[PDB]
Amino acid sequence: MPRIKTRRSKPAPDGFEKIKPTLTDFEIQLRDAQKDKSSKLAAKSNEQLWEIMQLHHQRSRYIYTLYYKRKAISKDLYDWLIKEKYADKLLIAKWRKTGYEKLCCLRCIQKNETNNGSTCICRVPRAQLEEEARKKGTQVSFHQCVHCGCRGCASTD
Protein backbone atom coordinates (compact mmCIF):
# COMPACT_ATOMS: atom_id res chain seq x y z
CA MET A 1 0.00 0.00 0.00
CA PRO A 2 1.80 3.01 1.38
CA ARG A 3 3.49 5.46 -0.98
CA ILE A 4 6.15 5.82 1.67
CA LYS A 5 9.05 3.41 1.17
CA THR A 6 9.05 2.05 4.62
CA ARG A 7 10.15 -1.27 6.00
CA ARG A 8 6.81 -2.94 5.54
CA SER A 9 6.94 -2.11 1.86
CA LYS A 10 8.14 -4.96 -0.27
CA PRO A 11 11.32 -3.73 -1.95
CA ALA A 12 11.37 -2.88 -5.59
CA PRO A 13 10.86 -5.12 -8.56
CA ASP A 14 13.51 -5.27 -11.17
CA GLY A 15 13.11 -3.33 -14.40
CA PHE A 16 12.05 -0.43 -12.19
CA GLU A 17 15.15 1.61 -12.95
CA LYS A 18 14.51 1.75 -16.67
CA ILE A 19 11.33 3.71 -16.04
CA LYS A 20 12.35 5.36 -12.80
CA PRO A 21 13.26 8.79 -14.24
CA THR A 22 10.06 9.18 -16.22
CA LEU A 23 8.20 8.60 -12.97
CA THR A 24 10.21 11.06 -10.94
CA ASP A 25 9.63 13.91 -13.37
CA PHE A 26 5.92 13.70 -12.75
CA GLU A 27 6.61 13.39 -9.07
CA ILE A 28 8.64 16.57 -8.64
CA GLN A 29 5.91 18.51 -10.43
CA LEU A 30 3.28 17.40 -7.96
CA ARG A 31 5.48 18.78 -5.23
CA ASP A 32 5.65 21.76 -7.55
CA ALA A 33 1.95 22.42 -7.99
CA GLN A 34 1.06 21.80 -4.34
CA LYS A 35 3.26 24.77 -3.51
CA ASP A 36 0.51 27.27 -2.62
CA LYS A 37 0.55 29.87 -5.35
CA SER A 38 -1.99 32.41 -4.25
CA SER A 39 -4.52 33.99 -6.58
CA LYS A 40 -7.44 36.30 -6.02
CA LEU A 41 -9.50 34.73 -8.80
CA ALA A 42 -11.58 31.60 -8.43
CA ALA A 43 -11.07 30.74 -12.10
CA LYS A 44 -7.43 30.31 -11.27
CA SER A 45 -7.65 28.22 -8.10
CA ASN A 46 -9.84 25.79 -9.98
CA GLU A 47 -7.23 25.77 -12.74
CA GLN A 48 -4.67 24.95 -10.08
CA LEU A 49 -6.61 21.81 -9.37
CA TRP A 50 -6.74 21.08 -13.09
CA GLU A 51 -3.00 20.65 -12.98
CA ILE A 52 -2.75 17.99 -10.29
CA MET A 53 -5.48 16.12 -12.06
CA GLN A 54 -3.68 16.50 -15.37
CA LEU A 55 -0.38 15.11 -14.13
CA HIS A 56 -2.05 12.28 -12.25
CA HIS A 57 -3.82 11.49 -15.46
CA GLN A 58 -0.58 11.31 -17.38
CA ARG A 59 1.27 9.07 -14.98
CA SER A 60 -1.56 6.60 -15.15
CA ARG A 61 -1.72 6.77 -18.94
CA TYR A 62 2.00 6.09 -18.93
CA ILE A 63 2.24 3.04 -16.71
CA TYR A 64 -0.87 1.91 -18.52
CA THR A 65 0.50 2.12 -22.06
CA LEU A 66 3.65 0.40 -20.92
CA TYR A 67 1.98 -2.61 -19.35
CA TYR A 68 -1.07 -3.17 -21.50
CA LYS A 69 -0.35 -1.48 -24.78
CA ARG A 70 3.21 -2.36 -25.64
CA LYS A 71 3.78 -4.78 -22.74
CA ALA A 72 7.09 -3.16 -21.85
CA ILE A 73 7.30 -4.40 -18.25
CA SER A 74 6.52 -7.58 -16.35
CA LYS A 75 3.44 -8.30 -14.34
CA ASP A 76 5.23 -8.10 -11.05
CA LEU A 77 6.70 -4.70 -11.71
CA TYR A 78 3.25 -3.44 -12.70
CA ASP A 79 1.45 -5.03 -9.80
CA TRP A 80 4.02 -3.67 -7.42
CA LEU A 81 3.47 -0.18 -8.79
CA ILE A 82 -0.28 -0.35 -8.47
CA LYS A 83 0.11 -1.65 -4.96
CA GLU A 84 2.21 1.37 -4.16
CA LYS A 85 -0.48 3.84 -5.29
CA TYR A 86 1.51 4.96 -8.30
CA ALA A 87 -1.53 4.68 -10.51
CA ASP A 88 -5.21 3.96 -10.30
CA LYS A 89 -6.31 0.40 -10.46
CA LEU A 90 -9.82 1.76 -10.99
CA LEU A 91 -9.18 4.35 -13.70
CA ILE A 92 -7.20 1.83 -15.64
CA ALA A 93 -10.07 -0.56 -15.15
CA LYS A 94 -12.10 1.94 -17.08
CA TRP A 95 -9.52 2.27 -19.83
CA ARG A 96 -9.90 -1.45 -20.22
CA LYS A 97 -13.63 -1.06 -20.81
CA THR A 98 -14.80 -0.53 -24.35
CA GLY A 99 -15.53 3.05 -25.21
CA TYR A 100 -13.88 4.91 -22.37
CA GLU A 101 -10.44 4.31 -23.71
CA LYS A 102 -9.43 7.99 -23.41
CA LEU A 103 -11.48 8.86 -20.28
CA CYS A 104 -10.67 11.83 -18.05
CA CYS A 105 -11.31 10.79 -14.58
CA LEU A 106 -13.59 9.10 -12.17
CA ARG A 107 -15.79 12.07 -11.55
CA CYS A 108 -16.62 12.64 -15.15
CA ILE A 109 -18.62 9.42 -15.39
CA GLN A 110 -20.55 9.92 -12.19
CA LYS A 111 -24.28 9.59 -12.61
CA ASN A 112 -25.21 10.17 -8.97
CA GLU A 113 -23.33 13.36 -8.25
CA THR A 114 -24.73 15.65 -10.93
CA ASN A 115 -27.84 17.69 -10.21
CA ASN A 116 -29.95 15.89 -12.73
CA GLY A 117 -28.77 13.54 -15.29
CA SER A 118 -25.17 12.63 -15.58
CA THR A 119 -21.77 12.70 -17.07
CA CYS A 120 -20.20 16.15 -17.43
CA ILE A 121 -20.42 17.74 -20.84
CA CYS A 122 -16.82 16.59 -20.55
CA ARG A 123 -17.92 13.40 -22.25
CA VAL A 124 -19.96 14.46 -25.27
CA PRO A 125 -18.12 14.18 -28.61
CA ARG A 126 -17.47 17.45 -30.36
CA ALA A 127 -19.34 16.12 -33.36
CA GLN A 128 -22.62 16.89 -31.60
CA LEU A 129 -22.11 20.06 -29.58
CA GLU A 130 -21.08 21.15 -33.06
CA GLU A 131 -24.58 20.17 -34.04
CA GLU A 132 -26.22 22.49 -31.55
CA ALA A 133 -23.67 24.99 -32.82
CA ARG A 134 -25.17 24.39 -36.23
CA LYS A 135 -28.87 24.61 -35.49
CA LYS A 136 -28.80 27.21 -32.77
CA GLY A 137 -25.76 29.13 -33.99
CA THR A 138 -23.88 30.19 -30.83
CA GLN A 139 -20.91 28.10 -31.90
CA VAL A 140 -20.27 25.68 -29.02
CA SER A 141 -19.89 27.16 -25.61
CA PHE A 142 -17.86 24.76 -23.54
CA HIS A 143 -14.22 24.75 -22.69
CA GLN A 144 -13.28 23.11 -19.41
CA CYS A 145 -15.18 20.47 -17.50
CA VAL A 146 -15.37 22.00 -14.06
CA HIS A 147 -13.69 18.98 -12.58
CA CYS A 148 -10.85 18.59 -15.02
CA GLY A 149 -10.48 20.63 -18.08
CA CYS A 150 -11.44 17.82 -20.35
CA ARG A 151 -12.08 18.75 -23.93
CA GLY A 152 -13.32 15.97 -26.18
CA CYS A 153 -12.82 13.33 -23.53
CA ALA A 154 -14.79 10.67 -25.38
CA SER A 155 -12.73 8.32 -27.42
CA THR A 156 -13.44 9.45 -30.87
CA ASP A 157 -12.15 12.95 -30.30
Binding site: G149, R151, G152, T156
Partner: peptide, 23 residues
Protein backbone atom coordinates in the same frame (compact mmCIF):
# COMPACT_ATOMS: atom_id res chain seq x y z
CA UNK B 1 -20.12 11.36 -40.15
CA UNK B 2 -17.21 9.00 -40.96
CA UNK B 3 -14.24 7.50 -39.13
CA UNK B 4 -11.71 9.07 -41.48
CA UNK B 5 -13.42 12.44 -41.03
CA UNK B 6 -13.08 12.19 -37.26
CA UNK B 7 -9.52 10.85 -37.14
CA UNK B 8 -8.28 13.62 -39.42
CA UNK B 9 -10.53 16.11 -37.65
CA UNK B 10 -9.22 15.64 -34.12
CA UNK B 11 -5.51 16.31 -34.62
CA UNK B 12 -6.83 19.86 -34.94
CA UNK B 13 -7.06 20.12 -31.16
CA UNK B 14 -3.79 21.53 -29.89
CA UNK B 15 -2.58 18.97 -27.37
CA UNK B 16 -3.36 15.28 -27.92
CA UNK B 17 -6.15 14.20 -25.54
CA UNK B 18 -8.18 15.25 -23.79
CA UNK B 19 -6.97 18.48 -22.28
CA UNK B 20 -5.92 19.64 -25.75
CA UNK B 21 -7.74 22.86 -26.59
CA UNK B 22 -10.22 22.92 -29.45
CA UNK B 23 -9.64 26.26 -31.19
Amino acid sequence: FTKSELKRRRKTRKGDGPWGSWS
